[PDB]
Chain A
Amino acid sequence: LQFMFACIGVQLFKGKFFSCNDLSKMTEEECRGYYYVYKDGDPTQMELRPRQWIH
């Protein structure tokens, strides 16, 4: 079963999961450079991050 679901997931997910930060980049190649993170929610607490990509 490990094999079966393996074969299922691979030929259905292989291109996926190469995640960015956050969704706001999409193409895991368009990704590059820094990227804001606002603590909590208030748009007066910015913090830079050399984000993306994600494995």
Chain B
Amino acid sequence: CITEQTQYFFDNDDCGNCSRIFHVEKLMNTNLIFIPCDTRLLIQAEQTSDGPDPCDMVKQPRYRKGPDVCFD
């Protein structure tokens, strides 16, 4: 704590870095590591989206005989 205060000054002078792991004991544990220890898990959801998805294949959907079998 106070040692983490001296560490806080050490940060002012190293590398606080959140690093999620989705693995571990089931839960999505976050991991700070500096260049203090594994804790629980949280957060994502996001607002801005990214990482382009793709497909560009098949996607058959056009038809010429959708039988009105319906149900029943």
- A touches B in complex, CB < 8 A: no
